[PDB]
Each structure stands twice: as structure tokens, then as C-alpha cells.
């Protein structure tokens, strides 16, 4: 599923990301835009053999288990397949654990490069929430 900008903003708000651990809603919408372009089925194979899965491109080396990644930690205790659903529940649950580390949203490279330091609120403006 490819979410519309406002559609995802509303969904993430329902999923409790409006002000989760100091991060405003716009951060999450912006992150999704640049990490997966709002595509829940997005996957990207990395050099180290790991793969980034879903709307928030969660990595198989540290966060989810896809059974094909060397040195897997599975910090989110969840199969990577669960992060490729049109239902964002699992991706949000895992993203919350990731951001609860001291590194915060810096875990998301696209967010760090295209969102951090910008007017992230702009990503939720002009939306019926």
C-alpha cells in the first residue's frame, strides 16, 4: 500500500506518534516519505547482507528477523515480514522501540538527511486529522 501524506499522518496519530518520546508527528511522516516514499511494501537489500523493510525501512540486522541476515539481533522481537503489511501496527511498535534508544530518530538515515533540522510540521499541515 502507498499511503497518501495526510492519510499516513492521520494513521500515525491513531498509532500514538503525535508526540512520542519528544518527537512531533511531522517527524514520522517526513521519515516515511524519504525512507520508503510512503510505500508499506518497500524493501532495500544492503551491503552487509541485511535488508530494510517497510514504511519505515527497519533493518534486519538489528531490529527484525528475516532469517537471512548475518549477526541478526532482532531487537524488536518480530519477523521482518510483519513489517511489510498495509497495516502499520508492527512497524510503529518497532519504530517506538528504536527511537527509545539514545540515538533517537537518527537511526533513520533518510530522516537524518532530509528531515532533521527542517520544518517537519509542514508534513502534517493541510490535513484533516
Amino acid at each position, epitope marked *: 500500500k502507498v499511503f497518501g501524506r495526510c492519510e499516513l499522518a492521520a494513521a500515525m*496519530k*491513531r*498509532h*500514538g*506518534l*503525535d*508526540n*512520542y*518520546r*519528544g518527537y512531533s508527528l511531522g517527524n514520522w511522516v517526513c521519515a516515511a516519505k524519504f525512507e520508503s516514499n510512503f510505500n508499506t511494501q518497500a524493501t532495500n537489500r544492503n551491503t552487509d547482507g541485511s535488508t530494510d523493510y517497510g514504511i519505515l525501512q527497519i533493518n534486519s540486522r*538489528w531490529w527484525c528477523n528475516d532469517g537471512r541476515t548475518p549477526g541478526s*539481533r*532482532n*531487537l524488536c*522481537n518480530i519477523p521482518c515480514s510483519a513489517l511489510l503489511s498495509s497495516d502499520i*501496527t508492527a512497524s510503529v*511498535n518497532c519504530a*517506538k*522501540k528504536i527511537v*527509545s*534508544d*539514545g*540515538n533517537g530518530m537518527n537511526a533513520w538515515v533518510a530522516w537524518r538527511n532530509r528531515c532533521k533540522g527542517t520544518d517537519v510540521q509542514a508534513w502534517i499541515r493541510g490535513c484533516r486529522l
Partner: antibody, heavy 113, light 107 residues
Framework: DVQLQESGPSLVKPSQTLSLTCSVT????????WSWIRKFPGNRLEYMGYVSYSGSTYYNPSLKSRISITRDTSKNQYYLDLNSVTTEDTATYYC???????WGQGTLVTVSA | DIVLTQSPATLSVTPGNSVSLSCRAS??????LHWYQQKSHESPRLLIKYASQSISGIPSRFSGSGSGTDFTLSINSVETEDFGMYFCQQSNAWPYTFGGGTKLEIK
């Protein structure tokens, strides 16, 4: 499967440092975030803090920075140090993973002269 | 900090009947409210996560509802094994905080 268990002295004196150990069996401590929670005499629960995968820690401001949570991969266990305890620190201490799925049995520590 | 207020403090019920426990947050916490059950001489047990999400291994009679500042834990047809303490906990802001608890006992 995973198992957690607290260990350490059950009786300590005021002003000393209270130290507890949580032994993890079933998986490496490097694969999760680890926490400490305590229950006071009147069914009052307090989340003390947790240490995440990067080594970063989050401590409850209520502890006034008297707390330290550390890990030891080689022994697959993590710890809780609480400095200058008082009778207000008497409580049942529990270790559990961040998700809340795995908890230790809990251990009562009494602070008394 | 976020203050969680639970009510009633105590609730007596006859096995077979249903009940609902309340947990109110001083400030909005989204859906970041979790429910725990605790029996004497026992460690807390997670029943519901993120307000309404089910937990594998927990009886289906437990369900959670709510968002923002108002949350409820419901038990459809209370069983003897359900008597004990129930606590809500929020994870939207640090420090994580717990409600004062609701004691469920046989009437």
C-alpha cells in the same frame, strides 16, 4: 526461551550502595533493552530506568541521579546500583526487558539501621 | 511527569460477571498505555499493550480501549484467576509512570 532472575543482598544499611544483579538466560543481553522496576509497601510501582542497545541509559528523575544501570555481556547479566539509600528505598526490586514480556521473580530489599 | 489515575481503587465482583477498570492520564499519551496484572508474591504480567493490542498467551476475555487521556481495561466474565491488582503504565514520555492500581477481588 528467556529467563530473568534477580540476586543480591536482601538487607542493607542506610547511606550504603544497594546493588542488584539480573541474570539473563536464553538469549544475549545484546538483543534487547533492559529495565529495573520497584514496588513500594503500598502497591506503588516506580519505573527506575533502562539501558538500551547503544549503552544509553534513561533514569527516573525521582532517583536524583543516585542510580546506575550497567551490563556485562561476558556474564550475560545487567546490574542496578543505587547510592546513599534510605528507608524510603525499601521495596521489592524486579528486572524485566523493556517490552515487559519477561520479568524476574522480584527480590525484597530492606534498608534498616 | 505524566500522572496516571486509576479508578475505582477497589472493585468487588462475582465470578462470571464483567468489569471495566479506568486509567486517566494527566496529559495526552496517544495510545501509549499498557496494562499489567500483579498477584501477591508475583511479578507483574503484561496483559494489553498500546491501549488495545492483544498479547500472545493472555486470556481473550481481557481487552483494552481508549486513546489520549481516557483508557479502560475490560474483563469479559471474570474468573477466579483474575483476582489481584491491575496497573496501567504509560510510555509516551520519560519517565515511564504507573497508575496507583485497582484491586479486583471476589464479592
Amino acid at each position: 526461551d528467556v529467563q530473568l532472575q534477580e540476586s543480591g543482598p536482601s538487607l542493607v544499611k542506610p547511606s550504603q550502595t544497594l546493588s542488584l544483579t539480573c541474570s539473563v538466560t536464553g538469549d544475549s543481553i545484546t538483543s534487547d533493552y533492559w529495565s529495573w522496576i520497584r514496588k513500594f509497601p503500598g502497591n506503588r510501582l516506580e519505573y527506575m530506568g533502562y539501558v538500551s542497545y547503544s549503552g544509553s541509559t534513561y533514569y527516573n528523575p525521582s532517583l536524583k541521579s543516585r542510580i546506575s544501570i550497567t551490563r556485562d555481556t561476558s556474564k550475560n547479566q545487567y546490574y542496578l546500583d543505587l547510592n546513599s539509600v534510605t528507608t524510603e528505598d525499601t521495596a521489592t526490586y524486579y528486572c524485566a526487558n523493556w517490552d515487559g514480556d519477561y520479568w524476574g521473580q522480584g527480590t525484597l530489599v530492606t534498608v534498616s539501621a | 511527569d505524566i500522572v496516571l489515575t486509576q479508578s475505582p481503587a477497589t472493585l468487588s465482583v462475582t465470578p462470571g460477571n464483567s468489569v471495566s477498570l479506568s486509567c486517566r492520564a494527566s496529559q495526552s499519551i496517544g495510545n501509549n498505555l499498557h496494562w499489567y496484572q500483579q498477584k501477591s508474591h508475583e511479578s507483574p504480567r503484561l496483559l494489553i499493550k498500546y491501549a488495545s493490542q492483544s498479547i500472545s498467551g493472555i486470556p481473550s476475555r481481557f481487552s483494552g480501549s481508549g486513546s489520549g487521556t481516557d483508557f479502560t481495561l475490560s474483563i469479559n466474565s471474570v474468573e477466579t484467576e483474575d483476582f489481584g491488582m491491575y496497573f496501567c503504565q504509560q510510555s509516551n514520555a520519560w519517565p515511564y509512570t504507573f497508575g496507583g492500581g485497582t484491586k479486583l477481588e471476589i464479592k
